[PDB]
Design a protein around this nucleic acid. Structure first.
Lengths: 261, 36, 30, 308, 98, 153, 152
RNA sequence: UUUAUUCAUAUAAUUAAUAGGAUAAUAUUUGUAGUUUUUGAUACCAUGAUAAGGAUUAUAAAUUGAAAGUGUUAAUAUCAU
């Protein structure tokens, strides 16, 4: 785990995305090294390697590689693993004291990470809504060529309710394909620096960018309006094989008879 | 051992053992007289 | 000497056992 | 006889031999990268691993065996484990303690089974099912210290019981048969070998010193007839290697074993007979009726006279 | 036809001769990192970059040989080896011009 | 028959073992000779008494190797493998490519085992370098192909 | 996933133009699999993100068509070849497909014998040896000595 | 008178047979299976070399270049089931 961790750190320092995916792929291993040799990477080291790789790939807008690493973290159920390391350090201190230890939901909710993320989450939702509104307005401007189009009149995002529970509702019903709270917990620290306590708009921009990258529904709702491709038929008097009679919408030409399919 | 299934010392031993009766049985003593 | 065949490939192992195929089928069923 | 040089030197016919015959890989040497041990599958939740990290440090991890004495490890589990309020965490902790006491051969670690796990798994019809990591570790422990407590646990792993025998390793059966041959249980050899045959285990890839030790302890007549029919289940490469291993472990290489073998000549000659066989060459009532009328005939004829 | 030999091997026979033999994995020769300037010529001894040809290409081997020779040989043995003029000095007329 | 008597097989196998011992010992013997017979300083680091002590120590190491192959290659490079006739390398009693004697080469010509082309016995064959300059020019051409076409690094 | 499944679907496709006279032809397209996987190592596509069934087919085609340099130095030893022959002889009923059962474009009138001197260059050794008695009335035309015409 | 080879007289050398190891779904393995191991038929076949004599073609001044094929007697000699 430590050798592959230093390999991944070398790949971050060299900015080599293909070598990042290579170190991640040799971390995942095959049937030979895992079952026959019985030499596989521990879960904590796998989480550390996948987390620093996912952090770099989300920081530099690599959607497919970060989607693959996020699907690995979903498949291995490592979305709440940093909270597990924090709870484990607290339980190690408690068992060094002599107190009994357990793992429940409120034990994980009592950590500073989950409380801080739940406190910040309305600011993240407002940042996401503002950034999507600016993106939709830019799409409607560029659909014409700069005035505005009717594209940005009614977008796919609804308004946020004036409640933190309504904020969690809005983030779960508009970005529910990804775990929003785990992404906001991962985006908190940057190279050891706590961005959530020191640089607030930088942390909001980072968390909004990571949520917009990892979510597939955000990728499907932020699409540029394209022109309508019309069908065509061959000519009756065949002059060219490239010249075709185009199918015209009644919006383009008014009047005439109502047409069939 | 692959093609023939045995080796040459074992082959010589098998060849000596397959014909043990008609190699030597007696010393064939006596004298043969002329009968005409 | 009798000539060796130059259009006959070198004999090499490319395959799995019956047990390995059965264990693959069993693990995929699981 | 040959091919002339003014003839066109084309290929006569293509040969598809590797695609007609797909051969599995078979070398005489064993695999250099295999684990050659019993794997436990430590599957701890990643919060108790950070919590019990100074305690799991002195325990055997993946391909690592620390030199911690076992009296410190049992003392760590006796005090610290009731503090942990998780059932699967304490069971996987004791699987590493049983594994650590097996590698150091501390015979007093079976009291940890009676303390924690016996009353809820193996006492008076317990409905609970132990984890596979725990049963693998205690069966590896009882075989390494030659403990007689393997028998009650192995009977629980059958199809009526826990059904953990299809999940057993080939090295799990290798350390199993070596201990039963050392203790000399004739019924324990037969009940394991019937189970390996029923579960479709890799009979050819069992350790050869493990088979010849378990076969050496066969002395009873009814189990000796079982070994005769069972020895055909091995391959021809295996059964010729069992003869060379049995002859060496009773001959010059008898110092490889910790305890020397006992003199079983009826199994030595039968293994030597069976290995030569698999290798290539290099009406009492009606019959007794007939005997009585013949003696009746010779007395009437006078061939068997009376007293003179 | 009665004696037809083709001067071009057919596509089926080429395909059969190709499908029977495997590929060598190092023929792909892909490279994207660069050259290991420090480690690749100093790897493990069984798989090491073995020099070939002249003695100028054997840098580490000459060093290891000189270190081993200085290790095993005592100096009290190496004192006894004399040159030719050290033996010729005992001659009554050791030196004259050619 | 059968192929050749077994004493000649033992002799050819001892020649092959002498070749293998030459491959074993040549690098070590050449480094020991080139250190021990040098009068110039080896380096800036090792000078004076250290160089003379190192030369005496490597001479003591070189003399202590019982069985070191210092025999030149041309002393036993005329061994035939099929027959027991001993030829001389450099004369017409030996051919260098198939490495047999003149007698064995004539028997393998008359037997048809080799594929050799007969040419006139007073010409230079077909090689343009051989017709140009003789044996020395083809010698230099093999040298030019093997070594001197490469820019050393 | 889609490209390797298209490769495995094409390689398992039987053909009907040679009518399976010697073997299956399309299996050689599995030789494309060790190439494209290397392309994945250039594309940053992790090969562990493949399904288990497709990974079984890819490891099948890899053990059929891939070798390394260290195996290529040892794969032709006579021990392994004769073990292959012995394993085909002993149990070939388990693994066998059959046991289950000037410029020419400006040339039009070619100029022949253009006084190119063949006596400046040297080709003097053109000697040939013909058999004795080609037109002799006592020597027969047909004979076993006609076999002397093919000997070089 | 010294030396390259030759010759004299002192010598060393001796035996037999295989064994697959990284990136391969699991055999730990190789002083093991070999002992009375192989190097053992120089003969009286009818070979082949030597010397010797014959005939055919040039009616062109062109070409770098007018040169090539086909038959008989004596003596010597013949070591392979």
């Amino acid at each position: 785990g430590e050798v592959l961790h230093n390999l991944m750190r070398c790949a971050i320092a060299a900015r080599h995305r293909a070598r990042i995916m290579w170190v991640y792929n040799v971390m995942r291993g095959r049937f030979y090294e895992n079952v026959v040799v019985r030499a596989e990477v521990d879960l904590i080291w796998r989480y550390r390697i996948a987390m620093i790789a996912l952090e770099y790939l989300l920081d530099h807008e690599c959607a497919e590689e970060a989607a693959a690493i996020y699907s690995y973290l979903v498949e291995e159920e490592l979305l709440r693993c940093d909270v597990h390391v924090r709870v484990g350090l607290h339980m190690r201190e408690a068992i060094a004291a002599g107190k009994p230890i357990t793992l429940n939901n409120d034990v994980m909710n009592a950590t500073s990470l989950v409380r801080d993320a739940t406190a910040v989450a309305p600011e993240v939702a407002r940042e996401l809504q503002r950034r999507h509104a600016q993106t939709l307005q830019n799409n409607a401007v560029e659909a014409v060529g700069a005035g505005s189009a009717p594209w940005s009149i009614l977008g796919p995002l609804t308004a946020i309710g004036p409640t933190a529970e309504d904020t969690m509702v809005w983030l779960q019903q508009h970005y529910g394909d990804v775990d929003v709270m785990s992404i906001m917990r991962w985006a908190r620290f940057r190279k050891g620096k706590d961005l959530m306590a020191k640089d607030r708009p930088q942390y909001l921009a980072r968390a909004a960018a990571w949520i917009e990258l990892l979510s597939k529904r955000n990728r499907e709702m932020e699409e540029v309006p394209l022109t309508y491709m019309r069908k065509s038929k061959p000519l009756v008097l065949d002059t060219n094989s490239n010249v075709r009679v185009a199918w015209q919408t009644p919006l383009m030409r008014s009047g005439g008879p109502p047409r069939l399919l | 051992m692959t093609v023939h299934g045995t080796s040459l010392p074992s082959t010589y031993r098998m060849h000596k053992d397959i014909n043990k009766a008609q190699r030597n049985d007696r010393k064939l003593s006596g004298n043969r007289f002329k009968v005409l | 000497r009798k000539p060796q065949n130059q259009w006959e490939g070198v004999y090499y192992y490319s395959g799995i056992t019956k047990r390995q195929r059965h264990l693959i089928l069993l693990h995929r069923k699981r | 006889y040959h091919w002339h040089y003014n003839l066109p030197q084309g290929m006569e016919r293509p040969h598809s031999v590797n695609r007609t015959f797909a051969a599995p890989f078979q070398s005489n040497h064993s695999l250099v990268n295999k684990y050659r041990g019993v794997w436990i599958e430590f599957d701890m939740h990643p919060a108790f691993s950070v919590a019990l990290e100074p305690q799991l440090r002195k325990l055997p991890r993946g391909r690592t065996l620390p030199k911690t004495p076992a009296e410190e490890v049992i003392a760590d589990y006796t005090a610290l484990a009731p503090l942990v309020d998780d059932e699967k965490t304490r069971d996987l902790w004791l699987a590493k303690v049983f594994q650590h006491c097996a590698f150091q051969r501390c015979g007093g670690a079976m009291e940890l089974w009676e303390r924690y796990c016996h009353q809820r798994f193996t006492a008076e019809g317990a409905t609970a099912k132990p984890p596979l990591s725990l049963v693998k570790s205690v069966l590896f422990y009882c075989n390494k210290t030659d403990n007689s407590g393997w028998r009650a646990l192995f009977d629980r792993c059958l199809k009526d019981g826990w059904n953990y025998t299809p999940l057993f390793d080939t090295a799990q059966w290798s350390f199993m048969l070596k201990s039963i041959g050392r203790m000399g249980d004739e019924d324990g050899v037969r009940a394991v070998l019937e189970e390996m045959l029923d579960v479709q285990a890799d009979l050819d890839r069992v350790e050869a010193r493990s088979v010849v030790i378990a076969l050496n302890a066969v002395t009873n007549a009814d189990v000796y007839e079982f070994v005769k029919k069972y020895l055909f289940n091995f391959g021809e490469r295996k059964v010729k290697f069992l003869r060379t291993t049995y002859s060496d472990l009773r001959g010059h290489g008898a110092g490889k074993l910790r305890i020397p073998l006992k003199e079983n000549d009826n199994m030595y000659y039968h293994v030597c007979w069976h290995s030569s066989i698999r290798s290539p060459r290099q009406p009492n009532a009606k019959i007794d009726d007939i005997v009585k009328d013949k003696i009746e005939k010779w007395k009437a004829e006078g061939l068997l006279p009376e007293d003179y | 036809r009665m004696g037809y030999i083709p001067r071009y091997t057919p596509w089926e026979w080429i395909a059969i001769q190709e499908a029977d033999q495997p590929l060598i994995a190092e023929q792909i020769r892909q490279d994207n990192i660069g050259t290991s300037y420090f480690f690749s010529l100093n790897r493990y001894w069984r798989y090491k970059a073995s020099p070939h040809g002249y003695i100028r290409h054997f840098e580490n081997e000459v060093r290891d040989l000189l270190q081993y020779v200085d290790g095993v040989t005592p100096w009290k043995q190496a004192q006894k080896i004399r040159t030719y003029w050290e033996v010729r000095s005992h001659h009554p007329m050791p030196q004259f011009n050619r | 028959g059968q192929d050749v008597p077994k004493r000649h097989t033992h002799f050819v196998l001892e020649s092959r073992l002498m070749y293998e011992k030459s491959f074993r010992d040549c690098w070590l013997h050449s480094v020991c000779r080139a250190i021990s017979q040098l009068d110039e300083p080896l380096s800036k680091t090792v000078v004076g008494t250290h160089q003379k002590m190192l030369q005496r120590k490597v001479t003591c190491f070189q003399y202590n190797q019982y069985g070191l192959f210092k025999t030149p290659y041309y002393r036993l490079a005329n061994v035939d493998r099929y027959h027991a006739v001993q030829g001389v390398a450099g004369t017409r009693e030996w051919v260098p490519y198939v490495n047999v004697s003149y007698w064995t080469m004539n028997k393998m010509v008359r037997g048809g085992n080799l594929l050799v082309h007969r040419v006139h016995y007073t010409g230079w064959g077909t090689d343009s370098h051989l017709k140009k300059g003789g044996w020395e020019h083809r010698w230099n051409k093999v040298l030019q192909r093997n070594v001197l076409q490469y820019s050393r690094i | 996933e889609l490209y390797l499944r298209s490769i495995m679907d094409h390689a398992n496709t039987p053909t009907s133009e040679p009518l399976q006279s010697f073997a299956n032809i399309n299996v050689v397209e599995k030789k494309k699999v060790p190439l494209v996987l290397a392309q994945m190592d250039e594309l940053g596509v992790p090969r562990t993100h493949l399904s288990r069934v497709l990974m079984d087919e890819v490891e099948d085609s890899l053990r059929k068509f891939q070798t390394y340099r260290s195996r290529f130095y040892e794969w032709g030893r006579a021990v392994k070849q004769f073990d292959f022959i012995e394993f085909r002889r002993r149990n070939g009923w388990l693994y066998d497909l059959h046991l289950m059962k000037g410029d020419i474009y400006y040339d039009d009138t070619r100029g022949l014998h253009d006084r190119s001197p063949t006596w400046m260059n040297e080709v003097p050794e053109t000697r040939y040896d013909r058999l004795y008695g080609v037109n002799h009335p006592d020597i027969a035309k047909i004979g076993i000595r006609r076999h002397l015409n093919v000997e070089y």
